[PDB]
Write a protein that binds this ligand. Structure first.
Ligand SMILES: [Cl-]
Ligand SMILES: [Cl-]
Ligand SMILES: [Cl-]
Lengths: 96, 96, 96
């Protein structure tokens, strides 16, 4: 049902360049408290790397488990991750 | 408020090539248990045909009514539909 | 966390050309009753203007506060706005 991927980004000055929604305090989809990518910004690290996709659920940020955290905590994890940011993500597998 | 469309796809080896979310067991939007297209994969049948759109709600798969089913049942309907897959879909009409 | 923007569209004959979802009667995201842009139609005023983005939350339509209204009321506000339609919108700021 899902595919998983490790994606490490080099933040640089352009920034990670994606928007997120979700968290235990405000689920973005049903009761799923996941941190979801809602938008990817042209020129940002995510866009240049090419692997991250809209709707991807971020499960881990470097060593921080963000599978079940508040939106605030997800933001803090992303902010403190530094210049080298390892994302472990989950996405829906397409119907074939 | 809505537009409806019949779209029949020829699966071939590329596959239908779209992701879905939703169902009675896990509504993708509010209490709407609809089966929604969340992504369309380049090279797939859906993309090549061109008619199916992200956010389209699949109401019927061949002769199977998927208006109110579990996600599992929607998947099973799509899997068993064979090579010729008739989708009856609903989408929001745009504000003009 | 958010960015705000004023966007005024000239409706013309092409129409505003965007789809919306949400409202107090049927929240599109969690308990957020916001009116959200779900799609932007090529050739429409929104697309030609270029500023409006999918996921943008419409807070105001000319002088009508649509921050907390039914979907029906949001539609009525957009319909009665005439040819010159001032939208005040909110969107998520991206992670940098
Ligand atoms: Cl967004
Ligand atoms: Cl998806
Ligand atoms: Cl839509």
């Amino acid at each position: 049902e899902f595919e998983f991927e490790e994606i490490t980004l080099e933040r640089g000055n352009s920034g990670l360049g994606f928007s997120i929604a979700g968290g235990t305090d405000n689920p973005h989809i049903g009761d799923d408290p996941g941190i979801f990518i809602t938008k990817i910004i042209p020129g940002g690290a995510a866009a240049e790397d090419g692997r991250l996709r809209v709707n991807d659920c971020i499960l881990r940020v470097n060593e921080v488990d963000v599978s079940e955290v508040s939106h605030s905590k997800a933001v803090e994890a992303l902010k403190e991750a530094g210049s080298i940011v390892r994302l472990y993500v989950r996405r829906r597998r397409p119907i074939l």
